[PDB]
Enzyme design. Structure first.
Site, PDB file in Angstrom:
ATOM      1  N   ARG A  36       0.825  -1.206   0.000  1.00  0.00           N
ATOM      2  CA  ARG A  36       0.000   0.000   0.000  1.00  0.00           C
ATOM      3  C   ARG A  36       0.856   1.252   0.000  1.00  0.00           C
ATOM      4  O   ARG A  36       2.016   1.222   0.420  1.00  0.00           O
ATOM      5  CB  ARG A  36      -1.040   0.000   1.133  1.00  0.00           C
ATOM      6  CG  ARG A  36      -0.498  -0.142   2.545  1.00  0.00           C
ATOM      7  CD  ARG A  36      -1.628  -0.490   3.542  1.00  0.00           C
ATOM      8  NE  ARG A  36      -2.359   0.686   4.018  1.00  0.00           N
ATOM      9  CZ  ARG A  36      -2.177   1.258   5.210  1.00  0.00           C
ATOM     10  NH1 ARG A  36      -1.290   0.756   6.067  1.00  0.00           N
ATOM     11  NH2 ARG A  36      -2.884   2.334   5.555  1.00  0.00           N
ATOM     12  N   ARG A 106      -2.607  -2.577  -6.374  1.00  0.00           N
ATOM     13  CA  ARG A 106      -2.667  -3.764  -5.521  1.00  0.00           C
ATOM     14  C   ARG A 106      -3.558  -4.840  -6.130  1.00  0.00           C
ATOM     15  O   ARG A 106      -3.178  -6.011  -6.198  1.00  0.00           O
ATOM     16  CB  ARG A 106      -3.227  -3.417  -4.133  1.00  0.00           C
ATOM     17  CG  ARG A 106      -2.342  -2.524  -3.304  1.00  0.00           C
ATOM     18  CD  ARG A 106      -2.614  -2.661  -1.816  1.00  0.00           C
ATOM     19  NE  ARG A 106      -3.916  -2.120  -1.422  1.00  0.00           N
ATOM     20  CZ  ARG A 106      -4.177  -0.824  -1.231  1.00  0.00           C
ATOM     21  NH1 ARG A 106      -3.239   0.099  -1.422  1.00  0.00           N
ATOM     22  NH2 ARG A 106      -5.388  -0.444  -0.858  1.00  0.00           N
ATOM     23  N   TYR A 139       4.608 -22.003   7.791  1.00  0.00           N
ATOM     24  CA  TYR A 139       5.319 -21.632   9.019  1.00  0.00           C
ATOM     25  C   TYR A 139       6.832 -21.550   8.839  1.00  0.00           C
ATOM     26  O   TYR A 139       7.483 -20.710   9.463  1.00  0.00           O
ATOM     27  CB  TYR A 139       4.954 -22.553  10.185  1.00  0.00           C
ATOM     28  CG  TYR A 139       4.580 -23.960   9.784  1.00  0.00           C
ATOM     29  CD1 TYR A 139       5.458 -25.015   9.999  1.00  0.00           C
ATOM     30  CD2 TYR A 139       3.347 -24.234   9.193  1.00  0.00           C
ATOM     31  CE1 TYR A 139       5.123 -26.307   9.636  1.00  0.00           C
ATOM     32  CE2 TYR A 139       2.998 -25.519   8.822  1.00  0.00           C
ATOM     33  CZ  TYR A 139       3.888 -26.560   9.048  1.00  0.00           C
ATOM     34  OH  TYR A 139       3.547 -27.854   8.683  1.00  0.00           O
TER      35      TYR A 139
END
Length: 160
Positions: A36, A106, A139
Site C-alpha cells: 500500500r 494492488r 510456518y
C-alpha cells in the site's frame, strides 16, 4: 470487482512520468510490489535500507496497525530517494481522471500473482497484509516461500 488492465496500468505510468518522474517511480514500485502507498512512501524516504539480491529486492518493514511483525516490500528496481506525501499522489489523480488510482495497483498485482498460482496467503503476505488465519499454512520458511513465489511475478513483469 474492478481489476485494472495491463494497458490501464501502462497509461497511468505514462501519465505519471510526464507529470513527475518521482510520482511515476511511486506507481512503479506500487506495480512491482503490491504494497500500500504508505509503505511505498516509507521505503522511498529511506532507500538505503533496501536489500537487493540477484533476481529481486526486498525492503524489510514492520506492521504498525496492530501487533508488530516483519514483512517485506518486494521489488525489482533498486530504490531511489523520493520525498512526497499522499497529497502529492492525491493532486496527481485529481488532475488526471483517467489515471487509475494507485490503490488499484494492488488489485492488479494480487490478480496476476493468482494467475501465476501464488497461493493467496502468500499474496497477502507479499502485499504486507496480516494473516487471516491464526494457523498459517506456511510456518517455515516464510521469507523463502514468499521470495520464490514473488520471483514468478517478477519474471512475468520483466517480460511485460
Amino acid at each position: 470487482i474492478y481489476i485494472p488492465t495491463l494497458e490501464e496500468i501502462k497509461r497511468t505510468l505514462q501519465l505519471a512520468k510526464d507529470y513527475s518522474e518521482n510520482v511515476y517511480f511511486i506507481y512503479r514500485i506500487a506495480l512491482e510490489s503490491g504494497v500500500r502507498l504508505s509503505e511505498i512512501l516509507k521505503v522511498l524516504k529511506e532507500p538505503e535500507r533496501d536489500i537487493c539480491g540477484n533476481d529481486v529486492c526486498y525492503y524489510p518493514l514492520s506492521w504498525t496497525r496492530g501487533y508488530k511483525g516483519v514483512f517485506y516490500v518486494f521489488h525489482i528496481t533498486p530504490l531511489k530517494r523520493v520525498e512526497v506525501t499522499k497529497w502529492a499522489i492525491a493532486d496527481f489523480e485529481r488532475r488526471h481522471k483517467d489515471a487509475i488510482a494507485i490503490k488499484y495497483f494492488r488489485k492488479f498485482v494480487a490478480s496476476k500473482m493468482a494467475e501465476l498460482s501464488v497461493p493467496l496467503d502468500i499474496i497477502d503476505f507479499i502485499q504486507g497484509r496480516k494473516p487471516t488465519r491464526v494457523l498459517t499454512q506456511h510456518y517455515v520458511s516464510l521469507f523463502g516461500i514468499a521470495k520464490e513465489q514473488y520471483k514468478k511475478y517478477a519474471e512475468w513483469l520483466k517480460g511485460v
